[PDB]
Amino acid sequence: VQLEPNITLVLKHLASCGAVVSAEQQAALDHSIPIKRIEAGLRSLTLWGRLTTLNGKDYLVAEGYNVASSKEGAAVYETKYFYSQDGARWSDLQPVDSETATRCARIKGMLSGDPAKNYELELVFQIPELAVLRCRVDAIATATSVIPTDSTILNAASQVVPNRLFAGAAYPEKLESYQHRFSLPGSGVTLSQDLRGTWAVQYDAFKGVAQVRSLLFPGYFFYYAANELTWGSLYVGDGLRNNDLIFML
Amino acid sequence: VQLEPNITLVLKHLASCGAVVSAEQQAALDHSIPIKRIEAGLRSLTLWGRLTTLNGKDYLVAEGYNVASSKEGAAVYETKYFYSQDGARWSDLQPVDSETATRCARIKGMLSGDPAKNYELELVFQIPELAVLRCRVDAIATATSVIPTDSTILNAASQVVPNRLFAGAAYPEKLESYQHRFSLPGSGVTLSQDLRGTWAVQYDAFKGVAQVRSLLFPGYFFYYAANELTWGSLYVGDGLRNNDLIFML
Amino acid sequence: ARISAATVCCPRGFFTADDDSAELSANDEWVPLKGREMALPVNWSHRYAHL
Amino acid sequence: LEKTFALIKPDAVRAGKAQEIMQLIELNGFTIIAKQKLQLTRARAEEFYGEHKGKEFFPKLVNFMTSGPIWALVLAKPGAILAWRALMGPTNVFKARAEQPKCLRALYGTDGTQNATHGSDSPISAAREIKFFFPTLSGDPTIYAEPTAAAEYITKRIQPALAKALAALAREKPSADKFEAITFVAGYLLQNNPNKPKVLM
Amino acid sequence: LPLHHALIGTTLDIRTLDDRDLKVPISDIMRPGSSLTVPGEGMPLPATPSARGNLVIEIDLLFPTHLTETQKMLLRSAFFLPPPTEQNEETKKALRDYEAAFKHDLKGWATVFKR
Question: Where, per the database record, does this protein carry Asymmetric dimethylarginine (chain C)?
């Protein structure tokens, strides 16, 4: 049914999971997402998450793509990311290299608000802070990007597009009703072919709303409403995955 | 694309036009709309509007239908209307016969709170207030029920059903892109065929959102967002009619 | 101008009207009324002079 | 491609495990042709369990089957009957847990009679039961459409009422137009027929 | 029906033969031996399989068994209150005070919990 996720729907349905955005930032997003979407030329652009920084200011991160193709047996999305401290001006979030990402991997703890800080690693390496931000964001994105199963379909010229006449996920309180964004619609690869305890699902049958929490990355939340076929995902928190997950289970 | 207008999206897009409801009533609505949708056999129960009153206990009015057929050249919905003072507990609005339907249109004024109120006319005619409320709702729905054109379609057995392949209305600022809900899908009847000065359209072309306001009934607003393809309509204020349209315009 | 004179209002007793001039002075001893008492229109007063 | 009958008993519905059972059924290759949630009455259940008439377990079996709503399903597959017997597993839950631990009886059954599912045995019983719960579901165009069986069917049931109707019409000889005669004979058939009574008010 | 449900007005709750619940408001002061009618909520018509009758609520009031003298005073003051265009300023102030006292959030009896 829906074409793009609605920010107010995400904030309304994922509020119980502690995924919230301040009032000033709410209004600023409402007025500033369309402007950047038009300036960039992207058909879709939406709030991806809110990474919390040491001092008061936080990092709001949005992502946008024009069209998603089907290449090498996977749904390839060419995405572009933007970051901001206030919800008014959206600067660009540059991509990083491979070895630089490996060096991001060894930076832990909460990152600081200032986008000019440089971290020190080891021969000494100077790591920009926006590089660490991008490394964490891309790790979270490539780990958990949920979409209900068969809500997209191929077409002529082989571009995965929204499935306009979509029945709705049957048995929505089970992981088979959801999948990764980069999984092809035809294949039966769903949210159940990953580790056995990395996801949790809560369901309300009367309201018909399902919430999916990522346990590998504790701050990733997804909702799917059955009565109105609307689904959306949000990330709140620092970009660290709990490596000590097994003891938690 | 959409199959039923939301309550949250409608209350968000029509907030600027004064079409807002109390926050506690908003939460009560969120909980108690599905309860009434399941108690009654209805399959689509939305919020119709909110009528003011001499007290603070405004009338929240909701509308729901099971079947929507095509009878005698008109798309007829077997609607059922419910009312409440708070969003918690709903009651039903029984239809009124023609004698009362003509003896209820002469009672101009603002409705009181207790729905056990009797107005008097002339011999004396004692009319209940719920009859007047139903008369006003019926008149407003006859004059104002607006949906985008081609949003509905005819199937076998002549039932009007949502057009699941509706690609939105081109030129959403022209009144030719909107129609009454009780116009058959094939007929080329729109809001343009109404009186010229009755409807006002303000279209934000950058954010892509159109607002249609009724001037014959001053408190009826309708919004249509083209990028996300969501349309809704609400009515706030009392249900009295603007007779002297010629002088105001 | 018309709407302002009729509609703009302030809680009763919040101000004190000067007997000589139209000026209103903030009242130091005003004790607030709390709850559904501010819904009765007897507890409000006009803030601008009648047109 | 054959199809079989299968019902989820009240014990797996009172515990809210019906949806999981349907999902498991669909995951193994079945296709739910038709489903319906329904509560049997005593007479309907007794007519349903006609084969075990006057058995020792009949009282408790009919008392349990009408304690809550059940689900009725038609499952289609090339080997539907045998596949559903295998998936449904051994008929005794205590034997099932030892023999096949990952079977519907072991997973959801609790007692010898509360096995939580019921399936068909043979194609004749399956077709009979599908007709019992889904009177309008089409099927079996080979045994029914058979010149010897069709002639027997028309002679045994339809012919006795039709011969009297065509005689009365030949006696009356209504208007030579088709529609009047057709309406007359249809009204006659719907008026006096062997199995149904006549309604008066 | 309770007497105050008759006068003030409430909503009767009825579970129909079909699996639908029904909440019907009391539209006026229900007379003794009066009735209410909900169209389209009766048995189906044997002739046409779509139209139905109309459900008929026959009302039998349940008057209170005991009333105190102060309750009777309040009832007499309610049954003889002057029309709102005839009230003094003292009357309006007294009514406002009494309403603010009866609906007092902690020491008023407008809403109580059953023991």
Answer: 12
Integer Cα distance of B190 and B198 in angstroms: 13
For every residue of A39-84, DSSP letters joined together read HHT-SEEEEEEEE--SSS--EEEEEEEEEEEEETTEEEEEEEEEEE
Does the CB of B40 have a partner CB in chain E at under 8 Å?
A: yes
Nearest to D5 by CA among D56, D101, D64, D70: D70
- E30 interfacial to chain B (CB closer than 8 Å): no
- The alpha-carbon radius of gyration of chain B (Å, integer) is 18
Assigned token pair, A209 = 């709303």
* Contact yes or no for E100 and C42 at CB 8 A: no
**E18, E19, E23: residue with CB nearest B92:** E23
CA B218 to chain centre: 13
Q: In this structure, is the dihedral angle defined by the CA atoms of residues B34, B40, B45 and B50, taken in order, positive or negative?
A: negative
In angstroms, the separation between the Cα of residue B45 and the nearest Cα of chain E is 15
- Which residues of D are tagged catalytic? 118
Q: How many CB atoms lie within 10 A of CB E50?
A: 6
Which residues on C lie below 8 Å from E96 (Cβ)?
40, 42
Separation of alpha carbons D83 and D119, rounded Å: 11
* CA gap B224, B139 in Å, rounded: 23
On the CB side of B49, how many CA atoms lie within 13 Å of its CA?
A: 23
Distance CA E6, CA E66 (A): 17
* Eight-state DSSP code of residue D157: I
Beta strands A209-214; A199-204: pairing state = antiparallel
Binary contact (B91, E24; C-beta < 8 A): yes
**Residues in A lying within 8 Å of D, measured between beta carbons:** 171, 174, 176
Domain D2-133 CATH class label: alpha beta
> Are the beta carbons of B67 and B159 closer than 8 angstroms?
yes
Look at B207 and A34 and tell me if their CB atoms are within 8 Å: yes
CA torsion sign for B183, B185, B189, B192 is positive
Q: How far is CA B209 from CA A208, B3, B173, D118, in A?
A: 29, 19, 9, 56
Cβ separation B228–A9 shorter than 8 A: no
Spell out the residues 6+ positions from residue A87 whose beta carbon is closer than 8 angstroms to its own: A24, A25, A26, A27, A28, A29, A32, A60
* Contacts with A50 (C-beta within 8 Å, 6 or more apart), sequence order: A21, A58, A59, A60, A61, A235, A236
Q: With breaks defined as C to next N over 2.5 Å, after which residues does chain B break?
A: 122
Known binding residue D115? Answer is yes
Give how far E80 is from chain B: nearest CA, Å. Answer: 18
Residues of chain A with C-beta less than 8 angstroms from the C-beta of D23: 171, 174, 176
Residues of A in contact with D19 (CB under 8 A): 171
Q: Which amino acid is at A39?
A: E
Scan for tokens 């359209």, then name that residue. Answer: B201
Residues B78 and B71: beta-carbon distance below 8 Å: no
Work out whether the CA dihedral B129, B131, B132, B138 comes out positive or negative: positive
The position carrying tokens 């007290």 is B55
B89 touches chain A (CB under 8 A): no
**What's C13's DSSP letter?**
T
Indicate which technique resolved this structure.
Answer: cryo-EM
| D157 labelled ligand-binding | no
10 Å CB burial of residue A223 (0-12, 13-18, 19+) is buried
User: Which pair of structure tokens corresponds to residue D169?
Assistant: 């019409």
Helix H or strand E encompassing E4: helix E3-7
Q: Which residues of E touch B94 (CB under 8 A)?
A: 24, 38-39
Alpha carbon distance A61, A5 (integer Å)? 16
- Contact between residue B117 and residue B167 where contact means Cβ atoms under 8 Å apart: no
Q: Do D22 and A171 touch (CB under 8 A)?
A: yes
